[PDB]
Design a protein around this ligand. Structure first.
Ligand SMILES: [K+]
Ligand SMILES: [Mg+2]
Ligand SMILES: [Mg+2]
Ligand SMILES: [Mg+2]
Ligand SMILES: [Mg+2]
Ligand SMILES: [Mg+2]
Ligand SMILES: [Mg+2]
Ligand SMILES: [Mg+2]
Ligand SMILES: [Mg+2]
Ligand SMILES: [Mg+2]
Ligand SMILES: [Mg+2]
Ligand SMILES: [Mg+2]
Ligand SMILES: [Mg+2]
Ligand SMILES: [Mg+2]
Lengths: 252, 233, 120, 67, 49
RNA sequence: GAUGGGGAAGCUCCGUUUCAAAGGCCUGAUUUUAUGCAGGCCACCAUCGAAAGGGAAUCCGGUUAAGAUUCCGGAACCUGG
RNA sequence: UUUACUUAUUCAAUGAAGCGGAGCUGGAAUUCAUUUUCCACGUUCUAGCAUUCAAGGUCCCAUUCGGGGCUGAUCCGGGUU
C-alpha cells in the first residue's frame, strides 16, 4: 500500500541529475546557412572532463558569420581530436575525423558520432564513450541515409542530419571492474541518486511487489506485462524471453 | 587617389562576417501582425463558398471614381450646415408661421445598414454601394442577393472608410442613392448601367463559382514543377 | 512596408510618455518637515558616563530620533546649538531609543555648550 | 433592418458560408489569447438581443474554455 | 588592479599584460607566414586557370 | 519565485526565457526645449537565496564598573566626487 | 484500401539570416542551334587576424568640416525555417 521507489523517482525530488560540475549541454552547432550550403572552420581550444560523463568534451570556437564575436560550442570529443585542431562543419567539409558532415555527404561505411535524429537537433545518437554509428547506405530519392546504431538497430534518418566523423573518445571504459562500492559511489555521486539498489525481494510487501514471505522470493512471474500500471512494473517489463542468452543476436 | 586603395570584401561563407542586409522577410513580427497576415492567407487558402468571394470582385478604379464623384454631390449635412439650417428654419417659422418648410427638400446619400436594407426592401434605393471589407461579413453577405431580388442596382466597392468619408463617418459599410437630382439623373443612369453590367448581370454566374483554393508561393512553384515533370513529358 | 529593418527582431516602438498633469492635487497640503531639528534632537543624555564624556572628550550626548541619521543629527546640532560638529557616532540603546555621541570641533567646549543649554 | 437577416443566417450554421466563417474565426480565436477584448461583437444582432448597445460603457470580451 | 598605475599591469609590447612574449612572437610569425601563403595561393589559383 | 502565457469551478497550479511589440545610455542634430520626432550602438531578461562560499579599504598604544580593530592619541588605506 | 495537397492540428529550432522560384558566371551532352539538360557557384599545410553603413567605383549637393543615393553584395514572392 506504499508508493514504490521506481514510482517515487518520477517526482524528481532527490532523483534529479547532479549537474553542478557539468560543462554544459553537448550539442553540435545550430544548423545555419554556413553548414547547410558550405562549411565553417572552428578551432579545438580545450579537451576537458565532464562530470557524470565518460567521454571527454571538446570546446570548439567558431566565428559568428553575422556578428564580430566568437561562438564556443561544446562537442563530444571524438578519438584522435586534439587541441589546436581545425574542425570543419557543413555540407562541404572534408571527410576527416572530428568534422561534422551531413549523413548524405559521407560514403557508405563511414563511422560517425553525435548523430542527429532530425536535422538541426544538434546531436542525439552515439554520444556515449566509445560508441559510433555506421553509415550502411543512402536513398538519394526522398533523401534518407540508413545507419546502424550502437544497439545494432537499423535506422532511416534524413540525409540532412549531421554527425561527427569518428568514434566517441573514452572507449573501453566499462572494461575495467569498478572493484569497489566506493568507486560505484563516486561514479553515481556525479550522475544521480540511483545507487545503491535495495533488492525488492528484501523489502516488505508494502514497499514492493517482491516484498514479504518467509523466504526471499518473487512469488509470481517477474515478467511484467507492458500494459501493467505504475507500481506493478517491477522486474522484467514486457520481456520477450528470459534466461541466459545463448546463440546469436540480431533477430530479423 | 594614390593614398586610397580598393579592398573588396569576401562575403562568402567563412569570411568577412556578413554585412547588414534587408531581413524584413525574416522579421519576427508581433502576434497581431502575424495573426492578421495569416488570417488573410487562410481566407484564400480555404475554398470560399460562392456567397463570399463575390466580394473579391470590386468596382474598378475608373467606375469607382465616377461613382464617388456622383455620390460626393449628395453628402449629408454636417454639424455646421445643420446648425445653419436650424437657425434659418426656426427664426423664419417663428416670424412667419411657416409650416417648417423654410428649407428645400434634401438630396443626400442614404447610409446605415438597417436604413439601407429597409430602402432596398421598399424599392426606394436607386443605387446601393456595399463595402467589400465589412469585418463581420454576415452584415452584408445577403445584400447582393437582396438587391438582386428587389431589382436594386448594387456595386461591391472598395472601402468602408471611403463610404464613411462619403457620409461624414469613419466607416459606413453601405451607401445608397434613393433620389437623385435632375441634372445628375443621366449620370446616375449611365453609372447604374455600368454597375449592373459588372455586378447584377453577373450575379447568377458568380453564385456558382467557389473562391479561394489559391496556393502559396512555394506550393505553387512545387505544383508547377510537378506538372512540368509528370504532365508535360 | 518597404523599409530595410536590417534586424529580424521587432521591438516595441518608442512613443511619447507624457508627464502627469493632474486635475487635482493628490494630498492638497504638503506635510511639514517630518524630521526637523527639534525632534531630531529629543533631549540630552545626562548619565554620569555621558557627563564625563561631555567634560573630558568634548562630546555632547543626546537622545535622538530613531529615524534620524548622522547627517540629520549633525545638521540639527549645528542649527540648534550654533556649533560645528567634528564627528557623530550613533547607537541604538537596549531600550529602543537612539543615543548620539556628537564630538564638536576643537573651537567649541562641550562643557560650555552643556552649561548654556541647561544641564551640567 | 439587417439584424433579422443576421438572426436567420446565423441559424444556418452548417451552410457553406457559415462553415467557412466558423473555420476562419475559430482559427483566429485560437491564435489570440484565451481571454481577450473584442473590438466589436461578432454577432451584433445577438448582442442586441442579449442587451448590448453600441455606446460607451458596453464591452465585449472573447473567452476560450476547455470542453 | 584599479589602484595601481598602468605600468604595473602591462608590458611594453604588442599584447602587454594579455599574452606572453613567446605567444606574441608566435602570433607574429603565424600572421606573416599565413598572409604570404595566402598571396602565393591566390597567384597559384590565378595561374592554374 | 512574479511577469508574458497556459491549466484549474476556485483557493490557486505550471513554468523562469519560456509561442511577449519585455530597453535605456551614448550622442550628431534638436538646441521654436540638448528634447519626442529624428543620424547612429547594444539584452535569449524581474526578484529572493550564504553574519562559514565570492567580496574595496585599519593598525598600534591607551582608556571603562561595564564598550572597543567602533572611543581617545598617533599613523594609514579604500570608494565616490 | 492506397495515395496525393496544405491552411486546421501536431513536433522542433532560431537574436525567426539567407527559404522558394528565376538570373549571372565556371569546365559538360545536343538542339527545331528558338529552346532543352547536369553540377558547382569567393573559405582546408599552420592554436595569427577578420567588427565602425567596408574600402573602391559612380552620381547628386556643398564647400574649408562633407553628407546622401546606386553599386560593391543579381531580380521577384514578404511563407522565419
Ligand atoms: K515476496
Ligand atoms: Mg546492482
Ligand atoms: Mg542490492
Ligand atoms: Mg525485512
Ligand atoms: Mg503489493
Ligand atoms: Mg504481482
Ligand atoms: Mg525473512
Ligand atoms: Mg553603529
Ligand atoms: Mg468603444
Ligand atoms: Mg510558481
Ligand atoms: Mg541577495
Ligand atoms: Mg564570507
Ligand atoms: Mg568586553
Ligand atoms: Mg580614531
Amino acid at each position: 500500500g506504499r508508493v514504490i521507489r521506481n514510482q517515487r523517482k518520477g517526482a524528481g525530488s532527490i532523483f534529479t541529475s547532479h549537474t553542478r560540475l557539468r560543462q554544459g549541454a553537448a550539442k553540435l552547432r545550430t544548423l545555419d546557412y554556413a553548414e547547410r550550403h558550405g562549411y565553417i572552420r572552428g578551432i579545438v581550444k580545450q579537451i576537458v572532463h565532464d562530470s557524470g560523463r565518460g567521454a571527454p568534451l571538446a570546446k570548439v570556437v567558431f566565428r559568428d558569420p553575422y556578428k564580430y564575436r566568437l561562438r564556443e560550442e561544446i562537442f563530444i570529443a571524438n578519438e584522435g581530436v586534439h587541441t589546436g585542431q581545425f574542425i570543419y562543419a557543413g555540407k562541404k567539409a572534408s571527410l576527416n575525423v572530428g568534422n561534422v558532415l551531413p549523413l548524405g555527404s559521407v560514403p557508405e561505411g563511414t563511422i560517425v558520432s553525435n548523430v542527429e535524429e532530425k536535422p538541426g537537433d544538434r546531436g542525439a545518437l552515439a554520444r556515449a564513450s566509445g560508441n559510433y554509428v555506421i553509415i550502411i547506405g543512402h536513398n538519394p530519392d526522398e533523401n534518407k541515409t540508413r545507419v546502424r546504431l550502437p544497439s545494432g538497430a537499423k535506422k532511416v534518418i534524413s540525409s540532412d542530419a549531421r554527425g561527427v566523423i569518428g568514434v566517441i573518445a573514452g572507449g573501453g571504459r566499462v572494461d575495467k571492474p569498478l572493484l569497489k562500492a566506493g568507486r560505484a559511489f563516486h561514479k553515481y555521486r556525479l550522475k544521480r541518486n540511483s545507487w545503491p539498489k535495495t533488492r525488492g525481494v528484501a523489502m516488505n510487501p508494502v514497499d514492493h511487489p517482491h516484498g514479504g514471505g518467509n523466504h526471499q522470493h518473487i512469488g509470481k512471474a517477474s515478467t511484467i506485462s507492458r500494459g501493467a500500471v505504475s507500481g506493478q512494473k517491477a522486474g522484467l517489463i514486457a520481456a520477450r524471453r528470459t534466461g541466459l542468452l545463448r546463440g546469436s543476436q540480431k533477430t530479423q | 587617389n594614390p593614398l586610397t586603395h580598393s579592398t573588396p570584401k569576401n562575403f562568402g561563407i567563412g569570411q568577412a562576417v556578413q554585412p547588414k542586409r534587408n531581413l524584413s522577410r525574416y522579421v519576427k513580427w508581433p502576434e497581431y501582425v502575424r495573426v492578421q497576415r495569416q488570417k488573410k492567407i487562410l481566407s484564400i487558402r480555404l475554398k470560399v463558398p460562392p456567397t463570399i468571394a463575390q466580394f473579391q470582385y470590386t468596382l474598378d478604379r475608373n467606375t469607382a471614381a465616377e461613382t464617388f464623384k456622383l455620390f460626393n454631390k449628395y453628402r449629408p449635412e454636417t454639424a455646421a450646415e445643420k446648425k445653419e439650417r436650424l437657425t434659418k428654419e426656426a427664426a423664419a417659422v417663428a416670424e412667419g408661421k411657416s409650416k417648417q418648410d423654410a428649407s428645400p427638400k434634401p438630396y443626400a446619400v442614404k447610409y446605415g445598414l438597417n436604413h439601407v436594407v429597409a430602402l432596398i426592401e421598399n424599392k426606394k434605393a436607386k443605387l446601393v454601394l456595399i463595402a467589400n471589407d465589412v469585418d463581420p461579413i454576415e452584415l452584408v453577405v445577403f445584400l447582393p442577393a437582396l438587391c438582386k431580388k428587389m431589382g436594386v442596382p448594387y456595386a461591391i466597392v472598395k472601402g468602408k472608410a471611403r463610404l464613411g468619408t462619403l457620409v461624414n463617418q469613419k466607416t459606413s459599410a453601405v451607401a445608397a442613392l434613393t433620389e437623385v437630382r435632375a441634372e445628375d439623373e443621366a449620370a446616375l443612369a449611365k453609372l447604374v448601367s455600368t454597375i449592373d453590367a459588372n455586378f447584377a448581370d453577373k450575379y447568377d454566374e458568380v453564385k456558382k463559382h467557389w473562391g479561394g483554393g489559391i496556393l502559396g508561393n512555394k506550393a505553387q512553384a512545387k505544383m508547377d514543377k510537378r506538372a512540368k515533370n509528370s504532365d508535360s513529358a | 512596408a518597404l523599409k530595410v529593418r536590417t534586424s529580424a527582431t521587432f521591438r516595441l516602438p518608442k512613443t511619447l510618455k507624457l508627464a502627469r498633469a493632474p486635475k487635482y492635487a493628490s494630498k492638497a497640503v504638503p506635510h511639514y518637515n517630518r524630521l526637523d531639528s527639534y525632534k531630531v534632537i529629543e533631549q540630552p543624555i545626562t548619565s554620569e558616563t555621558a557627563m564625563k564624556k561631555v567634560e573630558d572628550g568634548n562630546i555632547l550626548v543626546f537622545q535622538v530620533s530613531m529615524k534620524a541619521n548622522k547627517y540629520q543629527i549633525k545638521k540639527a546640532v549645528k542649527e540648534l546649538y550654533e556649533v560645528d560638529v567634528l564627528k557623530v557616532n550613533t547607537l541604538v540603546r537596549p531600550n529602543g531609543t537612539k543615543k548620539a555621541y556628537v564630538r564638536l570641533t576643537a573651537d567649541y567646549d562641550a562643557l560650555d555648550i552643556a552649561n548654556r543649554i541647561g544641564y551640567i | 433592418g439587417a439584424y433579422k437577416y443576421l438572426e436567420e443566417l446565423q441559424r444556418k450554421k452548417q451552410s457553406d458560408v457559415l462553415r467557412f466563417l466558423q473555420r476562419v474565426r475559430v482559427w483566429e480565436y485560437r491564435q489570440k489569447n484565451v481571454i481577450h477584448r473584442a473590438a466589436r461583437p461578432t454577432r451584433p444582432d445577438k448582442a442586441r438581443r442579449l442587451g448590448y448597445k453600441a455606446k460607451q460603457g458596453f464591452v465585449i470580451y472573447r473567452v476560450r474554455v476547455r470542453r | 588592479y584599479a589602484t595601481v598605475s598602468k605600468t604595473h599591469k602591462t608590458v611594453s609590447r604588442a599584447y602587454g599584460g594579455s599574452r606572453c612574449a613567446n605567444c606574441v612572437k608566435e602570433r607574429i610569425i603565424r600572421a606573416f607566414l599565413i598572409e604570404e601563403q595566402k598571396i602565393v595561393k591566390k597567384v597559384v589559383k590565378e595561374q592554374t586557370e
